Design a protein around this ligand. Structure first.
Ligand SMILES: Nc1ncnc2c1ncn2[C@@H]1O[C@H](COP(=O)(O)OP(=O)(O)CP(=O)(O)O)[C@@H](O)[C@H]1O
Ligand SMILES: Nc1ncnc2c1ncn2[C@@H]1O[C@H](COP(=O)(O)OP(=O)(O)CP(=O)(O)O)[C@@H](O)[C@H]1O
Ligand SMILES: [Mg+2]
Ligand SMILES: [Mg+2]
Lengths: 291, 286
């Protein structure tokens, strides 16, 4: 029932499962040591992350984990994407082997480095811009691979030992050319506070709906891991989005970067910047920083 | 989005004092609260309650499921072995679904906490009987739970077993829902073969789940199909694989589990038959 793909298959006896990285809703992720995984360096144990099902897994949990594996095969290598390293798909549970990011998700990373008195090492304004630029490059790459993430948010970004930002969690990602999928998708399982109005109301997913999400990701970054639409329950966001409600400027944010967020949140999707435009604009801001 | 007001279930927000979170869920949050007017007979009286609500990262489906859960609980009458709806805050704010507090939490953790390195055989039979009575009542209210398991049973300060988590429960008369259900969101290890392969949900699919619940109880919160990943259960169920007898279990109670797991749904006992058979075992025990 699981697909065979010999070029991605990693032998189970070379994989040593270690500490769980969090107890998980639709699966479990565990630290592991993989010995041959780097073909250049056989006999060398690489620390990896292994996504697998839990005991109380649903049919949909297995579907989603297979889809996530296949979506990662279809997406090329990029510096700012969590890349597939391998899979165990035969004579046992499904293991999807991905790059370990030692510093965890970006939400927790930002929150851990907050200055005191909002209610370890601090991030500079330049660091937050570097972060945003890196993620813009990741999404420009994804858009070019015909991939809509649909679940872009700080909690779905991972940070490596070298502070490289990596887009992760491709379980909800779809090919923009998947007509049949988009024609029948009923009730959304995308966090409402990160959804483009057209995605929320009309079930329209494009790279431009990902750009809206990127704007919320920017807001998350410049609030040092704040929660969007603070004090507004999801229940009331529906009505507020239709009336053109938008978030206000974070503390760690210039008017320039806040106007970019506002552009990301244009009512008309084609009037939002492309990721390509976001990479160029952010590059210019990063080089003009003047610490 | 906006909910209609059902005046008989509406509770005013200013009478509800949210307290300690009882654990962050996957599709929502449950919090302890004090509700003062909640019992209409006793207006002055502060009742400790549980409040189900959305999280900040809530999906459209999370809101749907919380509304459905509230509506399903309205249809179900009061019963000692069911978590009952007490009220809802549905207007000018986030949806609060107010339910009976069970101080000792879910049955899985309760049993695991009392494992030898506290429960008698009679206690485990009492547990099973109580839950059989709960499900007999639900079946009679035209409710299919679909997600019967130890983690969806709550234990009160007085060790009363209460069936909980009606989020996935459906009315047998909900044909529109059953006609279009795509990929299941029900834990595979508790699903009747007909529910898993054919998307057929009946009281008899709940009876299969009850059998797994029995196995969970008599293993003191064990994990079903031990060492068998969900991935390989699909094939094993088609070949008629069934779990073996727990240590703390009589041949009688194990044969009842096996009956609950009959291949043919109509050949599985009804909850009514399970209540009568378990009553007899409870009175003949000790
Ligand atoms: N490749 C990887 N390297 C390091 N940490 C990773 C990782 N992939 C995931 N993680 C982290 O492991 C933890 C797993 O927690 P959990 O299993 O509850 O997932 P989650 O909280 O992200 C819910 P979901 O992924 O279903 O949206 C998270 O902190 C996640 O960011
Ligand atoms: N009415 C109630 N009284 C007391 N405890 C309750 C309760 N309803 C839920 N709980 C407990 O609160 C905790 C929060 O978990 P929650 O109810 O969100 O489910 P869960 O964490 O098992 C995953 P799921 O969302 O799928 O149920 C659990 O320990 C649960 O058993
Ligand atoms: Mg995530
Ligand atoms: Mg539960």
């Amino acid at each position: 029932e699981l697909p065979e793909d010999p070029k991605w298959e990693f032998p189970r006896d070379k994989l040593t499962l270690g500490k769980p990285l969090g107890e998980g809703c639709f699966g479990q992720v565990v630290m592991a040591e993989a010995v041959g995984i780097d073909k250049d360096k056989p006999k060398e144990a690489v620390t990896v992350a292994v996504k697998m099902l839990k005991d109380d897994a649903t049919e949909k949990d297995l579907s989603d984990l297979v889809s996530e594996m296949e979506m990662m095969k279809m997406i090329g290598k990029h510096k700012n994407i969590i890349n597939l390293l391998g899979a165990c798909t035969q004579d046992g549970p499904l293991f999807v082997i991905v790059e370990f990011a030692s510093k965890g998700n970006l939400r927790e990373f930002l929150r851990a480095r907050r200055p005191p008195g909002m209610e370890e090492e601090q991030m500079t304004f330049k660091d937050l811009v570097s972060c945003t630029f890196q993620l813009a490059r990741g999404m420009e790459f994804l858009a070019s691979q015909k991939c809509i993430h649909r679940d872009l948010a700080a909690r779905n970004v991972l940070v490596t030992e070298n502070n490289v930002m990596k887009i992760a969690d491709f379980g909800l990602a779809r090919d923009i050319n998947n007509i049949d999928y988009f024609k029948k998708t009923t009730n959304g399982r995308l966090p409402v506070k990160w959804m483009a109005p057209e995605a929320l109301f009309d079930r329209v997913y494009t790279h431009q709906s990902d750009v809206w999400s990127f704007g919320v990701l920017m807001w998350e970054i410049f609030t040092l891991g704040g929660s969007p639409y603070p004090g507004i329950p999801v229940e009331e966001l529906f009505k507020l989005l239709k009336e053109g409600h938008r978030m206000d400027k974070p503390a760690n944010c210039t008017n320039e970067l806040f106007m970019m967020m506002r552009d990301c949140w244009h009512a008309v999707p084609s009037q939002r910047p492309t990721f390509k435009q976001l990479v160029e604009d952010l590059d210019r801001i990063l080089t003009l920083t003047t610490n």
